[PDB]
Amino acid sequence: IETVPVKLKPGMDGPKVKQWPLTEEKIKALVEICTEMEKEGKISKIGPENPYNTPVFAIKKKDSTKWRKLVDFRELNKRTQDFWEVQLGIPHPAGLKKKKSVTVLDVGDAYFSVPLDEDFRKYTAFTIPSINNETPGIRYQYNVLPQGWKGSPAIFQSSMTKILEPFRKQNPDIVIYQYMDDLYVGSDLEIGQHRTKIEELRQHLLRWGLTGYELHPDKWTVQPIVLPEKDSWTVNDIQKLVGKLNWASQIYPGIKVRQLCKLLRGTKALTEVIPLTEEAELELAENREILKEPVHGVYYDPSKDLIAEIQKQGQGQWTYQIYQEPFKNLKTGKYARHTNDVKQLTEAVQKITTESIVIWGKTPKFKLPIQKETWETWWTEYWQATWIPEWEFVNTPPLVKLWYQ
Amino acid sequence: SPISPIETVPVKLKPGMDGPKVKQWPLTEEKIKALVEICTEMEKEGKISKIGPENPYNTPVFAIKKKDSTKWRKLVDFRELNKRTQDFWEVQLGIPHPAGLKKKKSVTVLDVGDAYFSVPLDEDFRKYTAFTIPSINNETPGIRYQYNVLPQGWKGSPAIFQSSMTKILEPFRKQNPDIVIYQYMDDLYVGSDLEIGQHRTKIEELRQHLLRWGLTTPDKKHQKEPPFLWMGYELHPDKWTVQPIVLPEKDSWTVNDIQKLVGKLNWASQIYPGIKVRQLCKLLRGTKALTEVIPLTEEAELELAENREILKEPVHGVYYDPSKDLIAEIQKQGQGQWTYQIYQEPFKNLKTGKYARMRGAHTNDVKQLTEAVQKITTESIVIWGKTPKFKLPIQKETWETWWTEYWQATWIPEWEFVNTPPLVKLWYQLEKEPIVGAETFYVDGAANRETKLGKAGYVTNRGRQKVVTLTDTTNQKTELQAIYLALQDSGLEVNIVTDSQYALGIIQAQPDQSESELVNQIIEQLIKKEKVYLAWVPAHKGIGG
Numbered sequence: 001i002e003t004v005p006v007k008l009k010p011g012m013d014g015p016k017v018k019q020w021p022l023t024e025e026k027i028k029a030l031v032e033i034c035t036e037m038e039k040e041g042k043i044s045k046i047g048p049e050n051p052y053n054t055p056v057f058a059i060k061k062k063d064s065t066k067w068r069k070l071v072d073f074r075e076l077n078k079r080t081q082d083f084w085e086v087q088l089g090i091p092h093p094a095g096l097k098k099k100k101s102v103t104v105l106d107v108g109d110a111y112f113s114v115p116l117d118e119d120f121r122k123y124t125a126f127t128i129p130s131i132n133n134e135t136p137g138i139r140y141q142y143n144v145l146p147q148g149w150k151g152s153p154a155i156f157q158s159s160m161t162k163i164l165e166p167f168r169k170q171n172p173d174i175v176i177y178q179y180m181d182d183l184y185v186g187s188d189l190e191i192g193q194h195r196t197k198i199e200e201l202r203q204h205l206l207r208w209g210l211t212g213y214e215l216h217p218d219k220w221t222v223q224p225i226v227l228p229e230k231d232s233w234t235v236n237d238i239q240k241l242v243g244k245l246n247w248a249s250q251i252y253p254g255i256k257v258r259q260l261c262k263l264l265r266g267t268k269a270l271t272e273v274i275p276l277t278e279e280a281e282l283e284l285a286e287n288r289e290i291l292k293e294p295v296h297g298v299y300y301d302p303s304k305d306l307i308a309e310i311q312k313q314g315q316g317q318w319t320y321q322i323y324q325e326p327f328k329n330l331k332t333g334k335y336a337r338h339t340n341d342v343k344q345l346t347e348a349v350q351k352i353t354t355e356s357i358v359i360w361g362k363t364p365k366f367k368l369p370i371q372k373e374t375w376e377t378w379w380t381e382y383w384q385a386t387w388i389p390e391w392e393f394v395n396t397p398p399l400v401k402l403w404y405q
Numbered sequence: 406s407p408i409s410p411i412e413t414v415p416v417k418l419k420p421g422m423d424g425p426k427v428k429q430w431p432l433t434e435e436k437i438k439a440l441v442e443i444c445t446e447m448e449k450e451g452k453i454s455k456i457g458p459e460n461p462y463n464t465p466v467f468a469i470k471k472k473d474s475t476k477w478r479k480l481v482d483f484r485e486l487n488k489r490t491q492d493f494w495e496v497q498l499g500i501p502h503p504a505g506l507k508k509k510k511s512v513t514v515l516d517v518g519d520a521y522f523s524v525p526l527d528e529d530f531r532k533y534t535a536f537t538i539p540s541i542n543n544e545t546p547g548i549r550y551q552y553n554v555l556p557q558g559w560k561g562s563p564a565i566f567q568s569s570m571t572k573i574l575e576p577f578r579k580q581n582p583d584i585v586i587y588q589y590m591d592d593l594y595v596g597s598d599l600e601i602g603q604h605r606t607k608i609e610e611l612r613q614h615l616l617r618w619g620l621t622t623p624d625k626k627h628q629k630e631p632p633f634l635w636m637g638y639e640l641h642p643d644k645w646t647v648q649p650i651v652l653p654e655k656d657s658w659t660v661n662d663i664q665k666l667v668g669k670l671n672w673a674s675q676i677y678p679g680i681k682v683r684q685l686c687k688l689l690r691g692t693k694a695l696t697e698v699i700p701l702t703e704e705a706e707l708e709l710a711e712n713r714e715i716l717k718e719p720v721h722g723v724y725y726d727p728s729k730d731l732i733a734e735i736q737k738q739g740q741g742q743w744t745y746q747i748y749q750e751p752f753k754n755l756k757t758g759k760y761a762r763m764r765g766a767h768t769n770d771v772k773q774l775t776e777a778v779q780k781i782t783t784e785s786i787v788i789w790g791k792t793p794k795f796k797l798p799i800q801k802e803t804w805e806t807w808w809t810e811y812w813q814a815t816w817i818p819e820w821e822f823v824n825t826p827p828l829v830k831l832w833y834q835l836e837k838e839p840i841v842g843a844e845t846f847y848v849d850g851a852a853n854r855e856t857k858l859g860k861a862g863y864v865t866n867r868g869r870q871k872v873v874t875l876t877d878t879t880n881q882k883t884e885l886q887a888i889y890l891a892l893q894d895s896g897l898e899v900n901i902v903t904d905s906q907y908a909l910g911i912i913q914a915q916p917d918q919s920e921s922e923l924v925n926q927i928i929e930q931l932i933k934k935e936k937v938y939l940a941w942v943p944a945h946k947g948i949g950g
């Protein structure tokens with residue numbers, strides 16, 4: 001198989017990302033995996049003349065005992081993006097998010113039998129570190145298309161197509177979107193039919209080598225920010241009430257407050273129950289009305305990063321919003337719970353990433369309510385996805401927390 | 406010394422760049438003479454070789470005597486070629502911690518003469534290693550030369566050499582798992598738990614392996630004896646430690662004396678539990694010259710004392726035992742200073758350490774303590790490949806209270822309360838609900854961006870009121886000031902309604918010590934209080950307040 005030639009982006013060159021301290025159990029796992037891949041000719045030891053580096057971790061994946069290797073190409077992917085995206089970019093079916101059932105199938109194996117352009121390999125260097133730095137890490141590079149590299153699916157697209165062609169012809173109402181190492185298969189069938197069709201599809205794959213996740217999009221919807229209902233209202237509640245209302249306009253056009261407001265005025269005691277005028281009962285209502293609606297005015301700009309912010313709300317529950325432009329939400333939902341905070345944040349992040357892949361075909365940049373170090377040390381304990389999105393660490397505004405509670 | 410029949414590492418200059426071509430400066434005759442002398446010596450050994458002036462490349466050469474001695478050393482100034490050579494793979498990117506070495510029956514040190522000069526250099530590369538010994542003054546063509554081995558002070562020498570060393574050892578390891586070799590610079594630490602006998606055998610069997618490869622080394626009666634000095638440590642058969650520390654006695658201290666002192670102490674605190682340093686540091690801030698003498702504070706002096714106390718008579722650390730567990734215990738030692746110990750059997754430390762930094766402007770103890778835990782957790786994974794069981798001066802409950810209602814996600818691995826004062830606590834809760842029958846202050850604070858003056862004040866709901874003026878402030882400062890007033894004129898319980906997300910944020914955090922003075926007062930208030938409930942609202946959307 002003569003190889004498709006791969007360029008970097010002009011004026012920049014490969015990644016040199018530091019590797020992360022890894023725990024013994026993971027290092028062992030990686031030494032096995034990497035022995036076996038070397039045998040299979042997938043990767044080859046390299047010499048000090050490769051300065052490049054990409055971090056590498058081991059995960060386990062939902063309901064699997066088997067350690068599995070996970071390379072972090074986030075840096076490489078930005079340094080190639082011209083190739084994988086604008087140059088060999090996979091179109092995105094707005095249809096996918098409508099279907100009643102989306103099964104998600106791991107397809108990383110595909111790649112493993114396409115050679116990597118010879119002059120690109122050096123870019124895929126990784127290291128297996130050793131405890132206490134007692135021995136220099138084992139350094140490798142890939143000979144075949146690596147998983148988690150955004151180039152891999154791009155290159156491997158036309159094979160994918162041939163592979164998928166017949167099944168596609170025979171079931172013209174099943175959407176199949178590929179994003180990286182996964183295939184998203186969406187159908188409108190009774191679930192059993194669906195499952196059958198998935199199995200049926202597995203056979204096709206299984207004839208070129210290939211070899212779960214059951215999602216039901218169409219039944220994703222609002223999360224209308226909720227204004228307490230109730231007879232009686234302390235100043236506090238009304239205070240807390242306007243406050244929350246206050247937040248909502250800015251993203252919600254038409255919101256209304258001042259009516260509710262004049263209920264306030266003068267230094268009354270907080271814990272003081274107070275009469276309620278019933279036109280100000282209308283704002284309440286018609287805000288409530290709107291408050292369940294989409295933001296009128298907000299569209300997804302395919303030329304612009306997505307961002308996803310996450311807030312913590314005790315009781316094992318977290319809120320989150322996706323948008324491209326502060327306050328103009330494309331979407332906003334919630335997650336609910338032996339789980340700790342981090343374990344949870346990690347599950348949440350994957351959940352959202354994956355919704356996000358299905359809706360837009362790209363992954364958001366996360367703003368996480370956690371300490372950089374902590375997230376870093378801990379997240380691989382729970383990570384089960386084959387991709388890794390982008391993240392930062394931030395200090396939830398005190399009030400953002402409630403306006404969403 | 407031989408020259409390795411081994412493979413070769415293909416080097417390369419940076420893309421779109423060419424070799425070096427720097428002119429050779431005129432040299433004195435004696436210098437010129439030494440070079441001729443040195444080179445023909447080297448050249449006799451194939452280390453280097455004669456070339457033409459057809460080869461268009463040149464790097465300069467120099468030659469100096471040697472401190473006091475009566476010999477001559479050749480200097481090559483690779484700067485330029487170094488600056489045109491491809492980047493390599495960082496050499497050794499961590500260094501073992503004694504605390505992590507698994508103890509061994511017997512270990513000996515092998516080193517290696519002609520480190521770099523025993524290993525070949527990619528051939529197509531040598532061309533660029535061109536240099537020239539010039540002819541007495543201007544006249545004549547100088548003599549031209551280039552490298553066959555790895556030149557000293559060239560960019561790739563350290564990587565390639567360490568790489569080679571690794572390729573070589575590879576086999577001998579395979580056929581000897583029970584044996585451990587630590588490569589360092591050009592030294593070899595080798596150890597096993599086999600009896601004095603086949604050790605030296607095994608060693609010799611190594612010195613041979615190294616010979617079949619052009620690597621020559623000391624033989625018994627030449628290699629050093631325990632304790633090995635290395636990287637600042639003292640490594641004995643049983644324990645390890647930092648190297649002899651001498652904290653001198655003097656009357657005057659300069660900014661220099663104190664810096665050096667702080668450094669020695671920090672280094673010593675790896676294994677000397679208790680070492681303190683913050684008084685000494687204060688002395689350093691907003692600083693004059695290096696030669697400047699700083700009068701030791703009295704507190705500072707107590708430190709200097711309490712430190713010599715600890716350092717008076719030795720402490721050692723034990724090695725690591727992959728089988729048993731890791732326990733880490735932390736103590737609060739004072740103003741944002743924490744100190745810890747790790748060991749596997751009650752009180753034989755594998756190491757000690759300290760944590761101080763101040764993450765944030767306002768923080769509380771519980772926060773600080775979990776930062777330590779993380780910092781200790783990482784250091785641990787690096788060193789032992791696993792996280793230790795912790796013992797902390799905080800009740801499970803205090804900890805459960807804080808994490809529970811903290812905006813940020815958080816998470817300590819396994820731990821157990823241990824009762825060693827000071828204990829860590831929250832110094833005040835804040836109400837969940839408004840307080841029935843207790844004054845409601847509506848406070849506010851403003852500041853003229855120009856005059857920079859501000860009014861700060863409040864108006865409660867038993868119609869009381871105050872106002873104040875502030876000469877050089879900001880909005881932020883004013884709003885802390887209001888909440889401060891309202892907290893002062895209200896005794897035991899009070900509700901406060903600010904529209905300052907800023908102040909609110911800070912106080913919802915339960916700070917308990919703060920860079921800001923004003924915030925610290927608010928804190929002394931907050932502890933005196935008995936029931937405070939604080940609440941926010943938007944302003945200019947002007948409201949009941």
Ligand SMILES: Cc1ccc2c(c1)CCCN2C(=O)SCC(=O)Nc1ccc(S(N)(=O)=O)cc1Cl
Nearest residue numbers: 506508509510511512587594596631640641642
């Ligand atoms: C720099 C350095 C120092 C030391 C070591 C390494 C690297 C890696 C190999 C292991 N290693 C050791 O020295 S640990 C072995 C140990 O517990 N200490 C020890 C045991 C026996 C002996 S003995 N019997 O005198 O040879 C000497 C020592 Cl210093």
